[PDB]
Curated annotation (Swiss-Prot):
One of its GO terms (cellular component) is mitochondrion. Its EC number is 1.5.1.3. This is Dihydrofolate reductase. It is an enzyme of class 1 (oxidoreductase). The keyword Oxidoreductase applies.
Amino acid sequence: MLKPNVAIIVAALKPALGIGYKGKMPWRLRKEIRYFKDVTTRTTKPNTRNAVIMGRKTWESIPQKFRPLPDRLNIILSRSYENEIIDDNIIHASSIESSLNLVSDVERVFIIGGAEIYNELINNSLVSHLLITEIEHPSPESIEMDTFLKFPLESWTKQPKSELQKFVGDTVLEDDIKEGDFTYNYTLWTRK
Ligand SMILES: NC(=O)C1=CN([C@@H]2O[C@H](COP(=O)(O)OP(=O)(O)OC[C@H]3O[C@@H](n4cnc5c(N)ncnc54)[C@H](OP(=O)(O)O)[C@@H]3O)[C@@H](O)[C@H]2O)C=CC1
Ligand SMILES: COc1cc([C@@H](C)C#Cc2c(C)nc(N)nc2N)c(OC)cc1-c1ccccc1
């Protein structure tokens, strides 16, 4: 692919946009996980797939039996990786852009974590879309958190729901989804 449009997909706790604690996610939101699966997997035309790109630490944190994430081309970035096509589902590379130069028959490209990767690529002009699950909690300070998004959202525009719906096709978007003490909403952002 040449100059693909890329989407960041992430779930973060407002207002500080925390996304992790000591290498783990600070929640397990079952509908959110299913949303992540559906959006990263779905294609708009047949006989294509999407790519998911992640940092080496996030890859290693997926239990080895459940990686690669099924039905998507998985790309793993490490500063120690030379370019290598491991198999039809796994690519090793050292830049998002060079990894995608190696690829054909891919529709959408999603960045799926983690914090270091997100915080670099937010300032990469290939990234055109942010799919942010905005999570709220009555006492967010009580949530164990040490890892945060650094997203300059002043340069971004949160789109109306109709734009997110168009992006996700027939995927059902429930509003104010509650699981335990967490309430969340799916959002779409584009560059100003
Ligand atoms: N809430 C959410 O939606 C999500 C949250 N997370 C959270 O993120 C946290 C993990 O993130 P983090 O620890 O930062 O790890 P990352 O998954 O971001 O991996 C960081 C690694 O990626 C590689 N890397 C980073 N930048 C580059 C570059 N420019 N070129 C090549 N390789 C690069 C490096 O690998 P190497 O060291 O091998 O060089 C680096 O050590 C966890 O707490 C997890 O819970 C993760 C996904 C989703
Ligand atoms: C979907 O499953 C996983 C997803 C992840 C990461 C890649 C993620 C994510 C993610 C989610 C859940 N929602 C959103 N909105 N964006 C994301 N990037 C993971 O990180 C170590 C681990 C798992 C995982 C998979 C199988 C078993 C256990 C954990």
